Symmetry: C2
Subunit: 301 residues, 2 copies
């Protein structure tokens, strides 16, 4: 029992972090096989990156893998990431994939500085395509990931902080999540919403863990729940969401729509000083998968 914001073990990713320096810019790179991936704004000197990159040479890029110099033998740009071909394949390359995630989905972040891993935490991709991260100067290039048995699915590379303190980045093909660009504009996060299906997952986690005070006799239809959801800036709940909560519904014996009825009353009434899973807020950064994983036993390696 217990319920914690759990990240994936980070060792497989730690063995891929390197330091990329060129000009007076230092950031983090990701070394897989014989390629190092890093944000393209490491490129020297309002930008036109094709212009700027044709003006560079391989020897401009200093790549540090621990104490070992990495010799760059080629470079190319892939959208907003740089691909630095090096003469050594990383002997610690895990089985991996590049995957783009959906808003509402979660991942683990290995925060890094100067190529050295600093900490690991668990995040969700917000509906407005930002992430509420924890990053200081020099963390650019840190990556977000999931692990599935032995395979690392990389989904996020960190690029920038927005005026509100939230974070924006790309998938590992260099395509930004959301309408953000890697230049200096007055760009801001759009308005966010709460991830309803996740809140419901977390309520099932609470019931699994003995927190039941918020349950009730009532029920509701999908349409009547959604009418109350939009009022409180919650994402609409889809029938697919209901099906995905099915297993959690079966384990606890609370129909999904019955749990919606409780969420409805929680939104209309607040929590009246009580807490759920040690939180005084409805938490929305656990997916149905996360809840099942943390309450069934599933491991990785």
């Amino acid at each position: 029992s217990g319920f914690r914001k759990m990240a994936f073990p980070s060792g497989k990713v730690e063995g891929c972090m390197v330091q990329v320096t060129c000009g007076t810019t230092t950031l983090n790179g990701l070394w897989l096989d014989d390629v190092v991936y890093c944000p393209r704004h490491v490129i020297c000197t309002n930008p036109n990156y094709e212009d700027l990159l044709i003006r560079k040479s391989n020897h401009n890029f200093l790549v540090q893998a621990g104490n070992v110099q990495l010799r760059v033998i080629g470079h190319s740009m892939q959208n907003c990431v740089l691909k630095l071909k090096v003469d050594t394949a990383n002997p610690k390359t895990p089985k991996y994939k590049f995957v783009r995630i959906q808003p509402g989905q979660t991942f683990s972040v290995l925060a890094c500085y100067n190529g050295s891993p600093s900490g690991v935490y668990q995040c969700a991709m917000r509906p407005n395509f930002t992430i509420k991260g924890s990053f200081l100067n020099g963390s650019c290039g840190s990556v977000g990931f999931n692990i599935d048995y032995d395979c690392v699915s990389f989904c996020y590379m960190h690029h920038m902080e927005l005026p509100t303190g939230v974070h924006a980045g790309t998938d590992l093909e260099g395509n930004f999540y959301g309408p953000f660009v890697d230049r200096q504009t007055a760009q801001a996060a759009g308005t966010d919403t709460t991830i309803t299906v996740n809140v419901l997952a977390w309520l099932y986690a609470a019931v699994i863990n003995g927190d039941r005070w918020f349950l009730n006799r009532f029920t509701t239809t999908l349409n009547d729940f959604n009418l109350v959801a939009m009022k409180y800036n919650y994402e609409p709940l889809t029938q697919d969401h209901v099906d995905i909560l099915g297993p959690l519904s079966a384990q606890t014996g609370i129909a999904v729509l019955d749990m919606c009825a409780s969420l409805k009353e929680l939104l209309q009434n607040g929590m009246n000083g009580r807490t759920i899973l040690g939180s005084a807020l409805l938490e929305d950064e656990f997916t149905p998968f996360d809840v099942v994983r943390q309450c069934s036993g599933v491991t990785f390696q």
Copy 2:
């Protein structure tokens, strides 16, 4: 910016997890140099463990390190841990220490099943010597740790769940944290308190991150703050605690006792619907060190 419950990168510990099987019991062991450490209640068949262990043989202990059998060549008991001497030193042994932590201090937990790492999260040792963990059947033997540059300080080995769903275990010399024993008794956690100095650290984290709505003109003496602290089941604040918050006081320019005055009003008045660092509760599982580390840049390797 941002503030997250951050764990240490786990790779150095992942390379030390193994599976220990003897009889019909399987749990996690920690393999450092040529010794595997694991909970002694893996011992076969109200117990007298000296009696039970003299009745065992080396070949009784099956140790699995990935796909590789580990040959046990000796065994001994050290309080509530078993030490299984194996014929192979772990080539991935990091620089390490065994250290016992204080209530109020934090650490990272690598939850494990069948010797395979499952997730990582950050914990505090509660004033009543429990930890509010996240553990399922088979996680016994998982360890808690901190990392300091390249050195892993192991502080916790997990043993059991208490009736309230919280967790109890030992340091790596096998001495229990708190008044818990590794046999079946009606043992329960004693009443807990909130870690005051940590709440104050987290308030400084909030101010560093732009949350200032709870600040106030007032101040207070230590004695008058403490008079309000005990009323709300908070640990007393010591002058040493005040000195440890000094650097955070200097960075933000809020005298420690001024921040106590705000905490005082937060306790007397509640939070009136607002949040701090995305929490509707006063958080007490970040130490002054944690806050500074996450808001200055410090890495490890």
